[PDB]
Design a protein around this ligand. Structure first.
Ligand code: NA
Length: 429
């Protein structure tokens, strides 16, 4: 039982501790203790009786199985032992291996690319999640993103043949739902990492699936065409039983200045008009500003070896180079990291989760956890996961790939945290 969730539902019903206990048929002392992160109670407890009393499903009071996780790690031997062949199109098409992840969560995947160069690789179905895909080498592979073979649907993801093999190969971001597959570009073997992030539209979709079909169709219509500052603003105004005319009046804004602002929301007139309207009507103007037009090719995010080389920089004690990124997918990140020292590692603290895989060297990952300082030694194909805000560092001489994903803190939490009075106190509270 999550005491945060229990307290929330007691407050929602306006029941006291005593009333909740009586309603549920439970000892009060047990409920007072349940308001205390972990004790023994919950399991043989009546999560069931509390659920019934508070008119919720038992899972709405359930505590997460992860508690206090900081770091999870998986040795090269364990990774190799995870191997699963995938048959497709009559052949042994891939091997797939799982990297470190908390139990239950989505594990990053390494694939052996086994479809030969003289067979067109049969497509998969696609998936909601966006992914960063990087070629580990040693061989070039073909990427396929469509039925028909064209420059837009078939392109070589090169492996690095040169020096600076800590930059392993080309990378790109796969768009949501695009079917994809890979074959070898020639005779040399190859592996890839495919790293997915959480879809941030997933919570919406989950709820929308449960809407009536009528309401679903109305939602789609609302979202069709270009989703512009104007189309969005008009839904905000309808929400508040306003028209463009009444809204402009309430905010002290001339009609023509609102129209001009909707034509160029990121202009100087634009931002000030929208902000003045948001203040007056109770909305956040930031969500009306432009993001980039979208482009469903892989051309825009595609990142070559040479791109990554040109990106090289010192990052504390590390050397870093960029993998592909997409400004429409702010919570998905990938970097190549070169490590080169025995102690004194620059502390890494990230605002969400990391997944790491070692590609060269016997590296040491250190962290500060609930039991004090902790460390693990990882060889190539060894991997780790770090929770948000877990302070850690790498020592040794080697290379690691650093991936990042996570809803918390993600870019949508950032937007809200900027609207929050004293966010740190709220969290402490
Ligand atoms: Na994009």
């Amino acid at each position: 039982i999550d005491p945060f969730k229990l307290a929330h539902w007691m407050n929602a019903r306006k029941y006291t501790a005593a009333q909740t206990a009586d309603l549920a048929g439970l000892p009060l002392d047990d409920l007072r203790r349940l308001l205390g992160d972990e004790a023994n109670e919950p399991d043989p407890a009546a999560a069931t009786a509390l659920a019934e009393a508070l008119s919720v499903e038992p899972s709405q009071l359930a505590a997460d199985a992860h508690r206090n996780l900081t770091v999870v790690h998986k040795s090269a031997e364990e990774m190799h032992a995870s191997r699963r062949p995938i048959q497709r199109d009559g052949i042994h098409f891939y091997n797939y291996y799982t990297l470190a992840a908390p139990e239950g969560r989505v594990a990053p995947v390494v694939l052996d690319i086994l479809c030969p160069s003289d067979r067109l690789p049969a497509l998969n179905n696609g998936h909601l999640e966006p992914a960063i895909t990087v070629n580990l080498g040693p061989g070039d592979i073909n990427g396929r993103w469509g039925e028909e073979i064209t420059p837009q649907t078939w392109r070589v993801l090169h492996a690095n043949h040169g020096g600076d093999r800590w930059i392993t190969g080309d990378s790109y971001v796969h768009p949501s739902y695009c079917p994809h597959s890979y074959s070898l570009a020639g005779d040399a073997p190859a592996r890839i990492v495919s790293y997915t992030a959480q879809s941030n539209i997933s919570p919406l979709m989950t709820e929308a699936n449960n809407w009536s079909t009528g309401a679903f169709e109305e939602a789609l219509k609302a979202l069709s065409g270009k989703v512009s500052a104007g189309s969005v603003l008009d839904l905000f105004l309808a929400r508040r039983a306003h028209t463009r005319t009444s809204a402009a009046e309430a905010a002290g804004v001339p009609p023509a200045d609102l129209e001009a602002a909707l034509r160029s929301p990121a202009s100087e007139t634009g931002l000030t008009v929208l902000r003045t309207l948001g203040r007056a009507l109770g909305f956040d103007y930031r969500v009306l500003l432009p993001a980039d037009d979208q482009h469903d090719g892989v051309g825009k995010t595609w990142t070559t070896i040479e791109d990554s080389r040109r990106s090289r920089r010192t990052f504390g004690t590390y050397e870093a180079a960029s993998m592909a990124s997409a400004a429409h997918l702010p919570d998905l990140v990938g970097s190549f990291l070169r490590v080169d020292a025995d102690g004194r590692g620059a502390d890494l603290i990230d605002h969400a989760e990391n997944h790491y895989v070692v590609t060269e060297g016997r590296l040491t990952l250190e962290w500060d956890g609930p039991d004090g300082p902790a460390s693990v030694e990882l060889e190539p194909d060894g991997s780790a996961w770090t929770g948000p805000f877990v302070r850690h560092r790498w020592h040794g001489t080697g290379t690691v790939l650093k991936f990042g994903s996570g809803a918390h803190l993600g870019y949508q939490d950032w937007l809200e945290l900027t609207n929050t009075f004293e966010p740190a106190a709220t969290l402490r509270r």
